[PDB]
Design a protein around this ligand. Structure first.
Ligand SMILES: Cc1ccnc(N)c1NC(=O)Cc1cccc(Cl)c1
Ligand SMILES: Cc1ccnc(N)c1NC(=O)Cc1cccc(Cl)c1
Lengths: 304, 304
């Protein structure tokens, strides 16, 4: 009973957080095996950020200029390299708390947990979604750079995000763990605008199925629709177009509730057209799009 | 930038979760030092729950009937006692991962993080608030009993909740770590109704201050009010009455924004009277009451 914006247990990632300082800049690093991953802008001063030439700036940095602190002890840096927008610091000690892990590049619409950190220490954990415009709506302040986004499948942590930047609109941009930015953003102090933040239709549908499973059924109507008719409505309301791939992954939710995906689409269509009329669904007065079909199944079945 | 329903990093609590089985009933236990805390209904069968006499049921249970498993290894039970609605199982080994901890009984309106668990394993973490009717709106399924609620102050974990029950309305009831239920609930399979779930006014005000800090200011009006005038409005909308104690703890937020508490109350008054008019505040279409003034300060300043 009940439905919450739930994050993965953060312990396995907490044991990986370290603090990386280079000159007078301090941010968070991720220590996995004998490597510490961190945003490359750790080598920059505030002046460098206007137009940094990271290859040129890195020439003036040696292994001893990278101070890595895990809790209260100092890691010895025996190597360094730049991979896209991340620095990889080879240390002389494997992280004893390194969990089983993978580096994955997620697609927009996918969700993940964020362990927000400052000076190598965790402050909190929350659930996020990679927006269709490749930004994330996080909760990050100066010093949160290097905080990571991840998913957990039983014992394996799949790292998918490393936080780098705050756009002038208060939305966040970052990279996968290979240092490639999500979206068109660059690690530079230059105004970069985000594209249309459309709503993740498949996720709103998954959340409507979760509401039905939990007893919120007022929005169920006597109607059905087609993918093409639905998508005309989705386009008008800046919702992502729904495909048969999306319908396929909503199948287990359709099977559990007995509500055909296209019938749920017709309920969503009427909600978009009429609004909630002062009503709520799962304690929300708007349509929630940061639960994937997988998140709904996991939460509703108790996967640990 | 940004504001999220953020939970405390769950790692320190994850290292405490064990699985407790008694007969054919399995639930979660909390292993701190050499004691395992769990709901006393672990000794009950489904038939016992109709009208259990826990003192009578416990006579037929010995130390060897309580199976405690931490990860994959078995803890030896050398003692057992009932304290209110919790069982305390003395084991022969101190939990090596026992963090610094305290047992605290929270007041309604206070928030905490929940590490939902099944069979001793964590599934996820989310932020909760003890409702004014002493229930919690969690996300729990059968087997989640024994999952705990907590707050963290630097290195000290303050355990405040242990989950026991699901009311017939899908809301949740439980105890502090001394086994005393929050509210009037009893650990019995008997219909027990909850009282009025009023809105936590001081928390909605704290959240309005967080919205102002993050740039959502449309709701700020040209008005002010008094505590007595505000409370007439709060009573009408089933909001908890606001006191000078509440005003005092909103002081740091008032000081940061330059918005007097009574001016923010007048903004809240107009929002209650007029609604949001299809607008949102911090990505929400309703007034959020599960952020305390302390949560807002912590999140907005980066306390780790
Ligand atoms: C101030 C803040 C708040 C939240 N999250 C953040 N990442 C930041 N920090 C920055 O954005 C600094 C920066 C400037 C230009 C390019 C890059 Cl890669 C990074
Ligand atoms: C089924 C479920 C879902 C979510 N949270 C739960 N705690 C439960 N389990 C129960 O409520 C079982 C129970 C029955 C009568 C008294 C007590 Cl103490 C406990």
């Amino acid at each position: 009973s009940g439905f919450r914006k739930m994050a993965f247990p953060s312990g396995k990632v907490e044991g990986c957080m370290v603090q990386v300082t280079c000159g007078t800049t301090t941010l968070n690093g991720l220590w996995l095996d004998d490597v510490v991953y961190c945003p490359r802008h750790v080598i920059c001063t505030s002046e460098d950020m206007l137009n940094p030439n990271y290859e040129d700036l890195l020439i003036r940095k040696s292994n001893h200029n990278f101070l890595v602190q895990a809790g209260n002890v100092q890691l010895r840096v025996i190597g360094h390299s730049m991979q896209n927008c991340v620095l990889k610091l080879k240390v002389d000690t494997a992280n004893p708390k390194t969990p089983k892990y993978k580096f994955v590049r997620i697609q927009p619409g996918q969700t993940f947990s964020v362990l927000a950190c400052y000076n190598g220490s965790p402050s909190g954990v929350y659930q996020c979604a990679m927006r269709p415009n490749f930004t994330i709506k996080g909760s990050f302040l100066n010093g949160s750079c290097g905080s990571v986004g991840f998913n957990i499948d039983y014992d394996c942590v799949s790292f998918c995000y490393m936080h780098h930047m705050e756009l002038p609109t208060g939305v966040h941009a970052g990279t996968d763990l290979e240092g490639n930015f999500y979206g068109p953003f660059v690690d530079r102090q230059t105004a970069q605008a985000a594209g249309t933040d459309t709503t993740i239709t498949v996720n709103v549908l998954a959340w409507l199925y979760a509401a039905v499973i939990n007893g919120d059924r007022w929005f169920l109507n006597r109607f059905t629709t087609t993918l093409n008719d639905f998508n005309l409505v989705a386009m008008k309301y800046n919702y992502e177009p729904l495909t048969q791939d999306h319908v396929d992954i909503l199948g287990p939710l359709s099977a559990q509730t007995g509500i055909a995906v296209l019938d749920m689409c017709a309920s969503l269509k009427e909600l978009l057209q009429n609004g909630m009329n002062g009503r709520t669904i799962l304690g929300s007065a708007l349509l929630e799009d940061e639960f994937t079909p997988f998140d709904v199944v996991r939460q509703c079945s108790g996967v640990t």
